[PDB]
Amino acid sequence: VHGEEYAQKMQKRFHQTDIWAPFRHRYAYMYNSSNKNVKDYKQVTLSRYINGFDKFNV
């Protein structure tokens, strides 16, 4: 809506395209930079005690 040139200019980040760095708000550090629990807070609270919240890996 701002124009093709405006869209192209706002969609470009690095003049040199050799380096790859996807946009991220923060970089993980815990669990050797890993997300140990990928779920909601209530989801984890239920999964720790209430059955059925874990879909398993098989």
Q: Which residues here bind another protein, judged by CB under 8 A?
A: 24-28, 31-32, 34-36, 38-41, 43, 47-57
Q: CB 14 → another protein: shortest distance, Å?
A: 22
User: What is the residue type of 57?
Assistant: N
Q: CB 35 → another protein: shortest distance, Å?
A: 6
Judged by CB, which is closer to another protein: 8, or 35? 35
Judged by CB, which is closer to another protein: 21, or 38? 38
Q: Are 37 and 44 in contact (CB under 8 A)?
A: yes
